[PDB]
Design a binder for this molecule. Sequence first.
Ligand code: SAH
Ligand code: ZN
Ligand code: ZN
Ligand code: ZN
Ligand code: ZN
Length: 254
Amino acid sequence: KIICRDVARGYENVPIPCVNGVDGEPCPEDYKYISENCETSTMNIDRNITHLQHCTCVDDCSSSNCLCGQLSIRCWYDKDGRLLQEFNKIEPPLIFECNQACSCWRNCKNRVVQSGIKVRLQLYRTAKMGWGVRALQTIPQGTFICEYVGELISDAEADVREDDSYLFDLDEVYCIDARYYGNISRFINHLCDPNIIPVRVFMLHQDLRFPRIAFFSSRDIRTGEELGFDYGDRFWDYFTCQCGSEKCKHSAEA
Ligand SMILES: Nc1ncnc2c1ncn2[C@@H]1O[C@H](CSCC[C@H](N)C(=O)O)[C@@H](O)[C@H]1O
Ligand SMILES: [Zn+2]
Ligand SMILES: [Zn+2]
Ligand SMILES: [Zn+2]
Ligand SMILES: [Zn+2]
């Protein structure tokens, strides 16, 4: 049987199994699973602790006076760590989580992304799109899913790389390249009917060149459902969409 118990090798809060019920391809081995972003050449990230804006809260950061919440416009997390229904899912705001400069505790309410993966996912072989990721549980709208993790590289570097299949733009542009080093998010396919959205988030640094990319569910997700986001019209403008949705706008057909 083609199967891996945990492609993350214990690095995430939960296992991420792999299965293939479709064809003869073994679990992918042509990359290195990493749970946090890496660098090869240095990006010279502004890690200066004194450049962090931070809050003075000594409660759990649930009040509207939390500076970090104000930097985000408001804290968009409800009491359970889910995005509020009012969250702009078309044009998400930048999220500034609490950090090591804040007065609050590490368990405050403004630290969802930095607390890591909580939902049960599976790497699996799709019918027509290669590998994909699907839910092994129901997941309410607004739930943090996973971060787009990979190798941070410059625009000029991305421009000369052989394989652009695993690039996520941090638009002056830097990219996250998950080709050689990446997490579960490298396997998330494009869907014309998407159920997750990427959100830019700041945690341990606030170097605006380098937002981290957090996927949140955009609606309730059912068990077994493939996870997917909108790669965008510019990406689509070699191969055509196989999402198979009645709404597909990028197939060879339509
Ligand atoms: N909607 C879609 N239709 C056809 N291919 C898709 C797709 N979304 C993603 N892909 C494929 O997946 C690549 C992005 S990386 C996503 C994981 C990939 N399916 C894998 O097996 O490793 C794209 O280059 C394309 O090959
Ligand atoms: Zn606060
Ligand atoms: Zn806080
Ligand atoms: Zn704070
Ligand atoms: Zn489609």
